[PDB]
Amino acid sequence: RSELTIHPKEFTTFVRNFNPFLGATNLHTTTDFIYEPLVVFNEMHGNTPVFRLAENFQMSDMSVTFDIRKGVKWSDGEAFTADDVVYSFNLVKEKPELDQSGINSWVTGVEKVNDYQVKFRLSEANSNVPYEIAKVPVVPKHVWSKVKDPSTFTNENPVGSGPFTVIDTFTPQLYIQCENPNYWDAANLDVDCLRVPQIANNDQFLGKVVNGEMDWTSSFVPDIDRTYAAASPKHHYWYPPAGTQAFVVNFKNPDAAKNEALTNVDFRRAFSMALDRQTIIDIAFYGGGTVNDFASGLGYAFEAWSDEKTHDKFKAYNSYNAEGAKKLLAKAGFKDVNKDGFVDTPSGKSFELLIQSPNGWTDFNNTVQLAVEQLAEVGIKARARTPDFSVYNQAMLEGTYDVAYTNYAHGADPYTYWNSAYNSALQSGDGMPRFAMHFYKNEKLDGLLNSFYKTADKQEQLEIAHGIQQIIAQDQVTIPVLSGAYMYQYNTTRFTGWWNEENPKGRPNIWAGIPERLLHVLDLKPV
Ligand SMILES: CC(=O)N[C@@H]1[C@@H](O)[C@H](O[C@@H]2O[C@H](CO)[C@@H](O)[C@H](O)[C@H]2NC(C)=O)[C@@H](CO)O[C@H]1O
Ligand SMILES: [Ca+2]
Ligand SMILES: [Ca+2]
Ligand SMILES: [Cl-]
Ligand SMILES: [Mg+2]
């Protein structure tokens, strides 16, 4: 049998948990591979919908119905039907802790129309809602209804719809997830098993990938041409452009001195001008990125959406200018009053910014250490922390952090970045990710975001985008640094069929949250 070695997520030890709603504690081979979506939107190719368990869908406006593919079975053998979909969406509406997106804010309810067809009722006008709906995991009703506790259910013997449901081998350091015996698309599948080794950080990953022990990965790799590519003719990669990375500052820091600094727009702009974004790219990412000098975080890949007058107005604040940063600090009134060379707050208080990035994410760790040095050059005191991801994440959810370095989801239009990074509704909820947790709130901004897909008028949507750009830019809510890359390494020793620059069928990454990985694995063939 052919075994495909993949690495979606760092772990110190595997805990057997295949619960699709528990994104913070499950294994990252659950979505897509155990639970196939209704539709995969191919985001690299204009969000072209690729139909899987649903064969079609139809909007109307307010209304949308999905037709279900008939003759699909679960891995046990039972039939896949429309009440599985209905069952699944009810669950999350009642337990909004399993809402990892904000889906409950859009869908008011769901109704079975027949054995292969389901209607979805909306809260507001949203031409983008089929994309949102595809995010919700569909689980089997003949199992999860018999389940007493979904919020804690670990689901160690999963019944799934996807290509790999069979747990063949499981240890704290290795598991192997094999083909669903009843898989509906089996004629299309040429890989027998997914092989998933425990790897805790980038250092551990590097030794393994360079030794040719991996097949499909998406980790940071330093000096990739000399370390990884040069080791074997079988060692390849392809890094299509990805999303924004930024320093995010906590507007609700509990320390008086740090709050005084972080909530000050002159201070955020001077922080931003202290940074040398191209040096960060050159050193921390070995060239693997593009400068992002948009105060709104938009990035150069959306030139067509950008209001260039706005971009030009605030670009000086997002360009390397150490002398300008020192002048702005002086003008704002951050004066050093205790002879240590670091500026103090207007109220006379000293402070040091603690900047966090996740443990093991060494490209971001190095970025933070570079920024620390650069900030010290303009008299801003900071130092780095590299906490375990869950600690890092919890600090942002609870608002106990000072500054955090983070990437963001990247979509075919600016909404994916702008909504996830700035919609204040995403700052409360216990299924919420880190991305909006600066705790800046602007009601006009939320309104513009909530209207982005409200009309089917392209010109108006463009005007809404320009308004969102204006607001974020003038308030320098975050400090955008660069636009990153979809890191992706593949090995042709054991498999062929890979997406790459000459075969760019979609986002090639193995991360959970990249639905296209289902379509990718269906293209792979054993050598
Ligand atoms: C938007 C987002 O949170 N994406 C996450 C990925 O960044 C992350 O992959 C990790 O990215 C780090 C930063 O570039 C790399 O240092 C690291 O090697 C890489 N890890 C792996 C295993 O690919 C993944 C996994 O943590 O989660 C995504 O959600
Ligand atoms: Ca195939
Ligand atoms: Ca001082
Ligand atoms: Cl290189
Ligand atoms: Mg090991």
Residue numbers in the entry: 1 to 61, 64 to 529
How did the manuscript describe this experimental structure?
VhCBP is a periplasmic chitooligosaccharide-binding protein mainly responsible for translocation of the chitooligosaccharide (GlcNAc)2 across the double membranes of marine bacteria. The chitooligosaccharide-specific SBP is localized to the periplasmic compartment of the bacterial cell wall and serves as a mobile component of the (GlcNAc)2-specific ABC transporter. VcCBP and VhCBP belong to cluster C/subcluster IV (C-IV), members of which are specific for oligosaccharides, including mannooligosaccharides, cellooligosaccharides, and chitooligosaccharides.
Mutation of Phe411 lowered the favorable contribution of the enthalpy change, suggesting a role of Phe411 in masking the N-acetyl group from water molecules, avoiding direct contact with water and forming a hydrophobic interaction with the N-acetyl methyl group.
